[PDB]
Amino acid sequence: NYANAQLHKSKNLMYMKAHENIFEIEALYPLELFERFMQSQTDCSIDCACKIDGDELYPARFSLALYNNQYAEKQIRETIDFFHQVEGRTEVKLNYQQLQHFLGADFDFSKVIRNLVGVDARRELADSRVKLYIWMNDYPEKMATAMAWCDDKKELSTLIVNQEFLVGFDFYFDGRTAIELYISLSSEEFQQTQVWERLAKVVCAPALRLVNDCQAIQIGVSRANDSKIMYYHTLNPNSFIDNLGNEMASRVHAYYRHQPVRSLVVCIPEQELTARSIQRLNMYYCMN
Numbered sequence: 001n002y003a004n005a006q007l008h009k010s011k012n013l014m015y016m017k018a019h020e021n022i023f024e025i026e027a028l029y030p031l032e033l034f035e036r037f038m039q040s041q042t043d044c045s046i047d048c049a050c051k052i053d054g055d056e057l058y059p060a061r062f063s064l065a066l067y068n069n070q071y072a073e074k075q076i077r078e079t080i081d082f083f084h085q086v087e088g089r090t091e092v093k094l095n096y097q098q099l100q101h102f103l104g105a106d107f108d109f110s111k112v113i114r115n116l117v118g119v120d121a122r123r124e125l126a127d128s129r130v131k132l133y134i135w136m137n138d139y140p141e142k143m144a145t146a147m148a149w150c151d152d153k154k155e156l157s158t159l160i161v162n163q164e165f166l167v168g169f170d171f172y173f174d175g176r177t178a179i180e181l182y183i184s185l186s187s188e189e190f191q192q193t194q195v196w197e198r199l200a201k202v203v204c205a206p207a208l209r210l211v212n213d214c215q216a217i218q219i220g221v222s223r224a225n226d227s228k229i230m231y232y233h234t235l236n237p238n239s240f241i242d243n244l245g246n247e248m249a250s251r252v253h254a255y256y257r258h259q260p261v262r263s264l265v266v267c268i269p270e271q272e273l274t275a276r277s278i279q280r281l282n283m284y285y286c287m288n
């Protein structure tokens with residue numbers, strides 16, 4: 001985006017290092033290799049994130065949105081190469097069968113609109129992940145494949161109104177894998193009467209009522225999800241966090257409230273919104 005690519009990358013790394021420093025996670029593998037991977041890219045945008053699970057916090061979470069989909073194929077090659085570099089430590093072994101099966105032998109890289117690369121580093125090495133997200137547009141054969149592999153209940157097929165879809169690949173360091181399908185709805189889209197009526201047949205009421213507080217939502221479905229995951233692109237980050245009644249989320253946002261943030265996305269499993277209190281959620285702070 002910005003003309004001074006090298007200035008912007010310096011700010012990216014400074015955003016990541018801050019996040020690692022406040023949460024005291026900098027030593028987790030493979031964050032240093034991820035930092036180097038960032039710097040090897042032409043330019044990208046960073047999202048710093050934290051996952052909340054009861055009393056536990058998993059804040060070693062970062063995503064890079066790689067600029068210029070003209071080079072989507074090369075980006076995936078260099079991402080895979082970075083995953084192999086992470087596999088440099090002997091007790092880290094990834095399983096690529098889901099990615100390989102999804103791409104097939106003649107993947108149309110001209111259909112990719114955005115690649116994203118992620119990490120969620122854990123104290124328990126076996127639980128850590130690297131992540132690849134492939135954002136696609138107007139690719140009906142791959143969309144149907146993703147729906148068959150991720151949309152058990154055939155619910156996202158009743159909700160989508162654009163040709164874009166996001167396919168996320170999880171690579172656990174002990175060889176576990178998961179694939180996830182995400183679709184998006186802007187405020188303009190989900191405020192249309194028929195679109196909203198379709199939402200209301202698939203999304204439980206407490207999760208649906210939250211959609212109104214948003215400039216956009218995404219919904220992620222996966223065999224590895226215990227319910228649909230709602231991604232709330234918050235209109236007012238401060239009030240959205242306050243309305244969660246979650247002490248740890250308020251503590252996290254207490255720092256970021258006064259930070260130059262492009263947007264705050266909060267994702268909550270549908271099942272959490274039918275409980276007495278929210279205890280599981282992710283917060284993504286997408287930096288400028």
Ligand SMILES: [Mg+2]
Nearest residue numbers: 168180220222
């Ligand atoms: Mg997921």
